[PDB]
Amino acid sequence: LMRVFSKEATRKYYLDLFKRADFTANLPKLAKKGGPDRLNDALKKLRKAGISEEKFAELKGAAAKYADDWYRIYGK
Structure with missing residues (x-):
């Protein structure tokens, strides 16, 4: 159950990355790391x-x- 909760936390963290990246205003900070495939x-x-x-x-x-x-x- 500790494991379950740990994976659930990890899952929600990535889901919230996608929610954060929906917004145009959040691109400049997001684009500083991970390149174009950051979300891929x-x-x-x-x-x-x-x-x-x-x-x-x-x-x-x-x-x-x-x-x-x-x-x-x-992009180049």
């Missing part, structure tokens, strides 16, 4: 912490929009 990479760790196929597909799209937002301003 967190999604891999969320999939290990447990995610439904439906939520994965949603966040797969959000992670691609993050990359697009990142390239738009920081």
Whole structure:
């Protein structure tokens, strides 16, 4: 049960990364670390912490929009 709660905390942390990245105002601070795949990479760790196929597909799209937002301003 300690384990369950620990994984749940980790899961909610990554889910909240995606919520934070929804907002345009949060991109400049977010873009300082992890590059365009910052959210693509967190999604891999969320999939290990447990995610439904439906939520994965949603966040797969959000992670691609993050990359697009990142390239738009920081890309070569």
